[PDB]
C-alpha cells in the first residue's frame, strides 16, 4: 500500500552518496515490490496443499514443521526490516545535524551493519534449506509418522524461481555496499 | 497500513530525551513491524490445523481452548497498546505546556508505568505457557474427551522463533527505560 | 485503518473540559483499538467451529441462532457508534458557535445521553447472555433437534477475557461522565 | 474506508437548512456505518450455511434463489445510492450559483425524490419478504426438488434485528423530509 | 477505495459541456459504485457453488467454462476502462491548450468513440449470453461429460437484477452522448 | 489502490516527448488496470480447481507444477516492474539536471532497455506455454502419477482472452518505443 511511503523514500532520497542516492535505493524498493506484489501469494497455500501419503493423524503437521521451521517469506520480511534500520537511523541523524567526523563515522558504520546483516540472512537460507532449490518430494520419519512417509510440496518450481531471484538481488546489494566502503576508504 | 502514522511518530519524535528520541521509538516501531508484517499470518491457522486423534465430537474445541486460553498475537496486541498510552499522554501534555516540576513528575511517571506494564505481560507469557517453547504434542483429558487424547499444534517451531524474538526485544526496552530513570535520578 | 481519523480526533481534541480533553478520549480510542486489532478476529469462526453432537440436518443452525441472537462484536460495534454521536454533535456545534446558556445546556445533555446509552448496552449484555462468562457446553432442544443436543462453543475462554475487558472499560467511562456532571453541577 | 469522504460530507455539510445541516446528515452517516461495519459480515455466509434436508443435486441452489431473489444488503446498498443522488446534485448546484426561484425549486425537488425513493424501497422490502421477520424454516417445492424440501436459514434472528433497525431509521428520515417540505411550504 | 480519485473526477469535472459537467459524470460514477460496492461480491462464488449432477471428474470445469467464457464482472470492468479513455485523453488535452478547430475536432471525436464502445460491449453481452436473463439450469454435453449433464448456477436471480441494471444505465449514457453530438452538430 | 500514485504518474507526466507524454503512459496505466482490477482474480483458483482423474496422492501437486512452472499473473507482474525501471531512473535524472549530450544518451538508453525487456518476456510466454492458447486437458506422466493421468484446467477460455489482450498491448508498446528511437535517430 502506498499510504505515505513517498515521503519516507523521498525524504531519504537525499542525504546519500553517488550510488546511495539512486542505485542502493531502487534495489531496496525492487525487493519490496517483488515480496509484496508477487511473492507473498505464492506461499499462501504452503501448508494447505502440503500432502502426505499416510493415514496417521498429526503426521502432516510434524513433517511440514520439520522441513519448514520458518517460511521463506517470513525470513525475507525479517531481512528487509533489519537492513532498513541503519539507513533509517542515519537518515534522521543528518536532520539533527542540519538542525563532521562523528557524522562520517556514523555514516560508515551504517554500511558496515548492512553487509553483515545481508550476509547472515543469506547464510541462514543456505544451512537451513541445504541450497536454493526446493524439492518436490520430502521423506519424513518424525514421530508419530510410522517408518518413513512421503510428502509433497506445493509449487516447488515457482518458489525456486523467486528464491534465486531474491538471493541474486541481495548479492548485488552487498557489492554496492562494499564498493561504497572502498570509495570512502581511499578518500580518507 | 501507513495512512497518517508518520504524523504521529513524527510528532512524538520530538518532546523526548537522549535515548527517547531514537532508540526507544525505533524498537517500538520494530515490534509493530514484526507483529503486523510477519507474525500475524503465522497464527492464521492456529485452530484450523489443530488436529486431535479422536472421534469424539467437540473434543477438538475444548482441548484447543484449554491449552490456548488467549492467542500469542492477541497478548502482543494488548501489550503494545498499553505501553503506548503513557507515551501518548505525555506527548500531548507538552503541547499544552507550549500552548517544570509537574512536567518533570509527569514525564518520570510515564517511564515507570511502561516498565511494570512490560514486566506484567512478560510474566503472563511465562506462567500461562510454562516457558517460551511451544511443543508439538499436547495431551488433553478435558470433558468430553475420553481418557487422554493426543493433539498436535500447527507450526510449533515458527511460533517459537517469533515468541523468543518478541520477548528479547521487550527485555531490551525494559533496560532502556531503567537507564532512563537512572539518568534522571542522578540529575535530580 | 488510519485514513484521516487524526483530523477527527485531533479536531475533537479541543472543545472539551478538564477530563474530556484527554481521559475520556483515550479510553474511547482504547476500546476501538481492542475491538479492531484483536477482538474482531476472535469471533471470526464463531459459527464455522460450532460443533453439535447430532446427525439431524439443520440442528446446528437453529442452536447457534438460539444461544447467539447477536454476536458480541456486533453489539460492541453498535455501542461505540451510539456513544460517539452526542460527542460528534457538540463537536460541530461549537464550530458554529465560533462561526452561552444554550451551549452549556447542549454540552451537559451530551454527557447525559452517553451515560444511559452505555448503561443500556451493559444491561443488554447481562440479560441476553446471563452473565459475562461463556460456557463450553450448551444444551439445545429447539426444533428440529431431537430431545436435547449437546453443542460446543469455539474459544469460550478467550471470548470471556475480552468480554470482561470491554465491560470493565465501559464501566470506567461511566464514572468519568458521572464526575463530569457533578463537576458542572456544583459550578452552576 | 475513510479515504477522502470527510471533504464530501464536510463540503455538503453547508448549503443546507435548519435540519438538513445536522439531523438529516448524521442519520445518513448512521445507516452507512451500520451497513459497512456490522451488517455486511452478517450476510457473509448466507448461501454457504444454507442447509436443505435432501439428497437431490441442485435443489439447494434453486431453493435459496427462490426465497432470496436479492440479498437484504444489496437492497440497502441500492437504496443508499439512490437517496444520496438528489442531495449530491443540489450540493454542486449551489457551487455553480455562488460561481433564487429556480434554486428554490431545485432544492424542494430533491426532498421530494428522497421521500418516494425511500418509500419505494421500504415497500419492496415488505412485498418481497412478506414482513420484516426472517423465519428459521422455509419449505421449498421448486424443481428439481422432490415434493417439498425443508431448508434452514443462517442467522435468522441476527438478520431480523438489523432488518428492523434499518427500516426504523429509514422511517425516521421520511418524517424529517416531510417536515422539511412543510417548513418551506408555509414560508412560501 | 477513495485514495486520490477526487482529484481526478474533480479535475475532469471542468473542461466539459452543459451535460458533460454533471449528468455524464455522475452516471459514470454511478456504474463504478454499483460494480465495486455490491456487484463484485455477487460473482464471488460463481464457480465454487456451481454444481453438476455427475460423478465424472473434470465435467464441472468444462461445463462452467463452456457456458461462462468470461464473467459478467470482467466484461463490465473492461467496458468502464475503454469508455473512460477518450474522456481522459481530452481531459489532459485542454490542459495543454491552456498551457480551436482542432480542439473542437478532438472533443467531438471522444464522444464518437464512447458511443461505439458501449454499443459493442452491449452487443457482446447479448450474443454471448443469448439475452439478459440467467437460467437456473444449464444442460452440458461437452467432453468428458457422458451424454447430457444437468448443472445449476449460483444466484441466478440476483445476477439477473444487476445485469438489467447495468445494461439500462449504459443505454442511458448512449442517449446523452447522442444528444451531445446533435447539440454540437446544429451549432456548427 | 490509489494512495499517492497520482503524484508519481503526474510527476513523470512531464519530462517526456511527443508520444511519451501521453500515448506511452496511458498504455502502461492500461496494463496495470487490467492486471489489478480484472485479471488478478481470474487466476485465484488456479490450483484449487485443478482436477486430475486419479487416486494417487501427490499426483495433483506434481502435474500442476509441471505444466505451470510460474503463473501468468506473476510473469506479468515481473514484466511491468522491469519496464517501469528505466522510465523511473530517467524521471529522477532530469530533476537532478534542473537542480545535454549525456542527458540525451541517458534518455535514448531507457527506450532501448524497454524494447528488449518486453521482447524477452514476450519470448518467455511463447516457449514456456507453447503458444497463447490454454488447453482444457493436460496429459501428465510425471512421478508418482501411474502411466498418464488426465488433468483439467480451471477457466481455460477466460485466461486465454486476457493472455491475448496482454500480449497485444505489449506489442503495441514495442512499436511506440521503436518509432521513438527512429524519431530521435533522424534528428541526430
Numbering used by the authors:
A (entry chain J), B (entry chain I), C (entry chain H), D (entry chain G), E (entry chain L), F (entry chain K): 2 to 100, 129 to 217
From the paper:
Connexins form large-pore channels that function either as dodecameric gap junctions or hexameric hemichannels to allow the regulated movement of small molecules and ions across cell membranes. The hemichannel is composed of 6 connexin subunits arranged around a central funnel. Each subunit consists of 4 transmembrane helices (TM1–4), an N-terminal helix, which lines the funnel entrance, a cytoplasmic loop, two extracellular loops, and a short C-terminal tail. Here, we use cryoelectron microscopy (cryo-EM) to determine the structure of human Cx26 gap junctions under increasing levels of PCO2.
Here, out of the eight given classes, the majority of particles divided into three classes, which, in order of particle number, result in maps with nominal resolutions of 2.0, 2.1, and 2.6 Å. It also had the most distinctively different conformation of the cytoplasmic tips of the transmembrane helices. Comparing the two resulting structures (denoted hereafter as structure Class 1 [C1] and C2) shows that the cytoplasmic part of TM2 flexes at Pro 87 such that there is an almost rigid body rotation of 14° of the C terminal part of the helix from residues Ala88 to Glu101. Morphing between these structures indicates that as TM2 moves, the N terminus and the following residues, including the first few residues of TM1, also change position.
